[PDB]
Ligand binder design. Structure first.
Ligand code: RAP
Length: 107
């Protein structure tokens, strides 16, 4: 599944609702491997709508349990990421992913 380890705590009260836009900064890497993506490097936060199957399961369930201002290490097993197929040209089959995700605001 997805393990969530807090890097910095949020307010512990303001959690995303289903259908709400989450505004996040993230860095993604293969577990004990190469960094493949970082929204911080392009200086523009990433946005997705929760409960719309817009992102991988590990992100859906991981961000759902985070409060505003929280920064966490998400360790996402293959079944909650890109599984046996992988993501063409970037993520190989059976890849465990590690994301550093900070929940900046809700809109
Ligand atoms: C250039 O950068 C890419 C993202 C890259 C792709 C490759 C991966 C390594 C990665 O580097 O991100 C990455 O770090 C990663 O794994 N991500 C992105 C950060 C959130 C978690 C994860 C993810 O789920 O990506 C996502 C993953 C790759 C595919 C989805 C996985 C869940 C599954 O249910 C979806 O089926 C549909 C497909 C990509 C996204 O986060 C984007 C935003 C969402 C989609 C494309 C779909 O949800 C789509 O559905 C029609 C939409 O509703 C969108 C909003 C419609 C508009 C027009 C499309 C915008 C496309 C944006 C693409 C962006 C910014």
């Amino acid at each position: 599944g997805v393990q969530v380890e807090t890097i910095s705590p949020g307010d512990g009260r303001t959690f995303p609702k289903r259908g709400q836009t989450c505004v996040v900064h993230y860095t993604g890497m293969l577990e004990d491997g190469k960094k493949f993506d970082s929204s911080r490097d392009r200086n523009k936060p990433f946005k997705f709508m929760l409960g719309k199957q817009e992102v991988i399961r590990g992100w859906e369930e991981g961000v759902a349990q985070m409060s505003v201002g929280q920064r966490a290490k998400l360790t996402i097993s293959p079944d909650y990421a890109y599984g046996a197929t992988g993501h063409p040209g970037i993520i190989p089959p059976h890849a465990t992913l590690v994301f550093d995700v900070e929940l900046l605001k809700l809109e």
